Amino acid sequence: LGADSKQERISKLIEISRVVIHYGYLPMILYLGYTRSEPKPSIIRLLSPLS
Amino acid sequence: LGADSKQERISKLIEISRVVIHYGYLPMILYLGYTRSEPKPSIIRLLSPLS
Amino acid sequence: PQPSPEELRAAEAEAASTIQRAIATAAVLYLAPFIVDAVYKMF
Amino acid sequence: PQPSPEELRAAEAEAASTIQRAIATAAVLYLAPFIVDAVYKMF
Amino acid sequence: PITGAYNALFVSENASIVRSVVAFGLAVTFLASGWAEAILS
Amino acid sequence: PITGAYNALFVSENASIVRSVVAFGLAVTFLASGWAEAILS
Amino acid sequence: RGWIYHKYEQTTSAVRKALSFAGRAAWTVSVTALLVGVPFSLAYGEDQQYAAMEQEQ
Amino acid sequence: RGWIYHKYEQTTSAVRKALSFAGRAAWTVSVTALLVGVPFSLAYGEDQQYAAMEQEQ
Amino acid sequence: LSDLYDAFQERRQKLGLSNPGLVENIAKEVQRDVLTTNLMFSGLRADLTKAFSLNPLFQVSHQFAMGERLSPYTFAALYGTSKMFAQGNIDDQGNLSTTFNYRWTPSFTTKTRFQITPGATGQDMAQFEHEYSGADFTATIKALNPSFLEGGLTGIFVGQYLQSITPKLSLGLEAVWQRAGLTQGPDTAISYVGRYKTENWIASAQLQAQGALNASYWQRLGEKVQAGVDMTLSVNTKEGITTFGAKYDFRMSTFRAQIDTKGKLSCVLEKRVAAPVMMTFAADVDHFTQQAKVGVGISIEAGGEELQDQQPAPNIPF
Amino acid sequence: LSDLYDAFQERRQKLGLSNPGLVENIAKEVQRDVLTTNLMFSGLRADLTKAFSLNPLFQVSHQFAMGERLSPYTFAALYGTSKMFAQGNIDDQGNLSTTFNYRWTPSFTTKTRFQITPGATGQDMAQFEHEYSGADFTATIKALNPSFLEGGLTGIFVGQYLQSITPKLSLGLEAVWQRAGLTQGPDTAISYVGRYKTENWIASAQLQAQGALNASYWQRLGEKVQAGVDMTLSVNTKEGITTFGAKYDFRMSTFRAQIDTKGKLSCVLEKRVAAPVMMTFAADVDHFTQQAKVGVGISIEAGGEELQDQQPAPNIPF
Ligand SMILES: C[C@@H]1CC[C@@]2(OC1)O[C@H]1C[C@H]3[C@@H]4CC=C5C[C@@H](OCCC(CO)CO)CC[C@]5(C)[C@H]4CC[C@]3(C)[C@H]1[C@@H]2C
Ligand SMILES: C[C@@H]1CC[C@@]2(OC1)O[C@H]1C[C@H]3[C@@H]4CC=C5C[C@@H](OCCC(CO)CO)CC[C@]5(C)[C@H]4CC[C@]3(C)[C@H]1[C@@H]2C
Ligand SMILES: C[C@@H]1CC[C@@]2(OC1)O[C@H]1C[C@H]3[C@@H]4CC=C5C[C@@H](OCCC(CO)CO)CC[C@]5(C)[C@H]4CC[C@]3(C)[C@H]1[C@@H]2C
Ligand SMILES: C[C@@H]1CC[C@@]2(OC1)O[C@H]1C[C@H]3[C@@H]4CC=C5C[C@@H](OCCC(CO)CO)CC[C@]5(C)[C@H]4CC[C@]3(C)[C@H]1[C@@H]2C
Ligand SMILES: C[C@@H]1CC[C@@]2(OC1)O[C@H]1C[C@H]3[C@@H]4CC=C5C[C@@H](OCCC(CO)CO)CC[C@]5(C)[C@H]4CC[C@]3(C)[C@H]1[C@@H]2C
Ligand SMILES: C[C@@H]1CC[C@@]2(OC1)O[C@H]1C[C@H]3[C@@H]4CC=C5C[C@@H](OCCC(CO)CO)CC[C@]5(C)[C@H]4CC[C@]3(C)[C@H]1[C@@H]2C
Ligand SMILES: C[C@@H]1CC[C@@]2(OC1)O[C@H]1C[C@H]3[C@@H]4CC=C5C[C@@H](OCCC(CO)CO)CC[C@]5(C)[C@H]4CC[C@]3(C)[C@H]1[C@@H]2C
């Protein structure tokens, strides 16, 4: 709050965070699954619907 | 055609016939069925949906 | 607009001719199996 | 229209009081089972 | 007499509320009395 | 060359007709040749 | 004369409204029994076949 | 500089259109296999059970 | 004189021809047996049918429906006999459709149909059809709303003819004459049809003189599978659509699926969930709009085993 | 000092109370288990789910749908563990909904949710929830779109508390504070809730201080049947609706049916047509308009027997 300029800064941080969540959140979940699931599936099988 | 008056007459005959078909045609089919089907069903069963 | 009295005669005449050539077509079809059979006899 | 500066104070004060009486309600509920149990002991 | 029960149930400002409250009272007594179990189970 | 086949199939006044005529030719040859029976039966 | 026509008008209108309600009521009852009774009867009927395979053990 | 930005604009637009078509194509293929393959597989699968009861005679 | 007729009729029969059936059935195998067009619907539908006898055929039917252009209720009753068939059905809105077919002769039958909408609403149609089935041809004339009260003929008159040319090939003709208003001139259309039918496949074409062409091909893909193709060209702009479909006959169910050049996919599954109960699932998918229409329907037949002793009356003129 | 706490905590536990669960679950048995409200849909729907592991839980899901307000496609993936649960799903239009729950302590868990619509379209919501589950109560605080950049607090803050009064009776409270615009004054609402739960029946009520009242009653009608009633009164004009419904549990299917005072009849049939395939039929009928909405859906689960050796991770914070 102290500087209005800072308020724009924080505003830019939210728009930065917003993009990272929009693009990176689902890849993050898939990364957590693929690297930590037991056993480890195939890269194609990781997104395969029923094979 | 010979008399225009007659043309109205014929016109009235069609409207007379139209009403008789509208009201009497389905009762006619049901009458034919009920009185001629073998065996003869019950009057209530005649219009019963599944009993 | 509505057709004139002489335009109706033209339309009624063309319509009659088409129906006459339709009946003429049915006459050819009715006789047609006798012709196609004759062709197979030649072969 | 927009609220005046003194109307906001009135609204903010009423809203604060309701939230204080909500927390006061939770305090009574938290202590409530001790009271209802006491009633059953008397019966 | 009955007019005071019909009007308040179908042609009054609060008539919509009364129908829902009555349906609730009937449905709960239907279940809790055991009549629902003897019919639906 | 191919432009004359694409334009007449998707961006011409009669393009709708050509697609239906082609689909008919392919579907009949699919059935009559026995390829349909070997796959669908 | 006109008194009978008025009664005829009162009756014709009221009966047409009566049949409209009575007909509408039969439809809603019939549709409900169909929409509820059909899926239930199929599911319940299948359950009885599974129950049969258990009783045969 | 600007020449790369133009190529970037040409590529960004075209690729977005490419993925839109490719994605739309995968959906129509998937939906068709589901709508046709599901009822067929259930009906055909049931037919095999009836065929089994005949072979057991 | 009979001297010519005797040689003519004998030579006629020597070619082994057979009745080609009605012109309207020239594409029945594709458009009615294989394609889903006539079975598609949306919403809920339930038909309750009670059969009271098989000879004479007499049954009552109640349809309940809630869907696109589906009337909430429709009562129907029909009576059939070796020489006659009477059928009537009425909507909840009073729309009455009637059918009355009578066999004056085993070769000649008259079909009369009436559609009587509420009096103020709509228009009423009266259709009189006369079908003659010969040893090798069929002739039909339909008069729809015929009128002579204005001092001249009025209405729609359709002439139909289908002739067996060879044991497999049949060719035919359709002619229409229209003069709804005496003030307006008559309008006439002629359509040519033909069909080549073999044991395993059937090819048919209908060519309207105005430019439209409808060709269909049907082929049996084994005992349980049959498929067909239907092409329609309209040049009244130019528009063409081709529909390809197949039908699978299982022991307890029938599956139909079709796709067409306009990207519409549809399938209909009919399954005998019980002896008297038949379930129907119909789904239409438009791939350009990604919109789907789902139809679930049931059919129930009360009569069951009570009337099986009777067997259906022969050749009822349905 | 602990001298008072020891006697207080010991006396507290002597009354045999138990955790009453979340305020939002005060009517789960009626509104979610028995009533169809959450299962109703129209059109076609297909869910394809692949499970890659059970501990940690990880699965991928593809939904295809064509219907009213149903997005054509939705990808989803989730990862769960005894201390955490991450879930994300995105529509074909780029609408991303996320969930991230983490157990800081077995009694304290944080739930974060994000809804990120396309940038120009819509608005983005950020919801931070903090749930504390005590021995006999639950406390929750939700902050939705919290903001302090204008120099003062802004957003929606919801406080929730549910307290077990007796082994069967639980009473609770809900408080809301809202100040979307600093220029506008804060708006606050308080809602009271309570629930009486026994083995065979459950009674619940939610009373908004503004006048609305929602009461529900659930009762088990034997081993396979359960029914419930849901009454909603709104006085913001006066409007009230009561929904009565029942649920039947068969060995291979579950049937739900409900009727309400507004004349709407709906039913949902879920049937296990195969080991991995579950069919769903949902139908809604409005008796005042005679209009029906039919929904047919399928669910498929690829993982099957491959991963049965693993058993699900305990108490994943779903
Ligand atoms: C304030 C409003 C007015 C309507 C209402 O609240 C809202 O008022 C309540 C009064 C309740 C009834 C009181 C007493 C019993 C006896 C009980 O025990 C019998 C034994 C059983 C075996 O278990 C059968 O023998 C059965 C149930 C019944 C009838 C209650 C039903 C629900 C009722 C109708 C409630 C209803 C919802
Ligand atoms: C005028 C327009 C152009 C397209 C078209 O009309 C419209 O022109 C026709 C030409 C036809 C093919 C001619 C010859 C044969 C051989 C036959 O016999 C093989 C034996 C079989 C065992 O039975 C397999 O070994 C198989 C079928 C095939 C390929 C025809 C298919 C249909 C076609 C493509 C027709 C198509 C509809
Ligand atoms: C009054 C109105 C018309 C009728 C109706 O209410 C409204 O009354 C209900 C009676 C129902 C039937 C009861 C029992 C069964 C058996 C079940 O299982 C058989 C398995 C098979 C295996 O071969 C033989 O074992 C199949 C379904 C069926 C016939 C019901 C169908 C729907 C019906 C007709 C319902 C319908 C909605
Ligand atoms: C690529 C996309 C995803 C997958 C898909 O294409 C599109 O590929 C198809 C394969 C189909 C399955 C094949 C075989 C059967 C067996 C049948 O009978 C079992 C009876 C049971 C008795 O207990 C065991 O005997 C039940 C159905 C099932 C599993 C099919 C379901 C639908 C599936 C998944 C179809 C789906 C549309
Ligand atoms: C009014 C219009 C006239 C055309 C048409 O209606 C519209 O009328 C039919 C004439 C048919 C063809 C006639 C004869 C044969 C010989 C046959 O031979 C196979 C082997 C056989 C020995 O010949 C077995 O022994 C192959 C097919 C073919 C070319 C027909 C194709 C379909 C056609 C074109 C039909 C088409 C729809
Ligand atoms: C005027 C309209 C244009 C479209 C159309 O008419 C209507 O044009 C016709 C062409 C026909 C095909 C011609 C020949 C054959 C070969 C035959 O195979 C026997 C083997 C034999 C020769 O190959 C030697 O043994 C199978 C049938 C097939 C494919 C016909 C199918 C029907 C077709 C496609 C007709 C189609 C409906
Ligand atoms: C904030 C508001 C306060 C009211 C409320 O939330 C909203 O809170 C609950 C209080 C409940 C009642 C408390 C106690 C009993 C005794 C019980 O006794 C059966 C026999 C038993 C011995 O008593 C077995 O041993 C019958 C039912 C009844 C009256 C409850 C009914 C439902 C009520 C009214 C609930 C209602 C929803």
Residue numbers in the entry:
A (entry chain I), B (entry chain J): 21 to 71
C (entry chain F), D (entry chain E): 8 to 50
E (entry chain G), F (entry chain H): 16 to 56
G (entry chain C), H (entry chain D): 62 to 118
I (entry chain B), J (entry chain A): 21 to 256, 265, 267 to 347
Task: Quote from the publication.
Two other preprotein receptors, Tom20 and Tom70, are loosely bound to the TOM core, forming the TOM holo complex.
Visual comparison of the corresponding maps from both preparations revealed no differences, indicating that incubation of the isolated complex with pALDH does not induce major conformational changes. For this reason, and due to their significantly higher resolution, we focus primarily on the pALDH-bound TOM complexes, noting that any interpretation of the structures may equally apply to the complexes without bound preprotein.
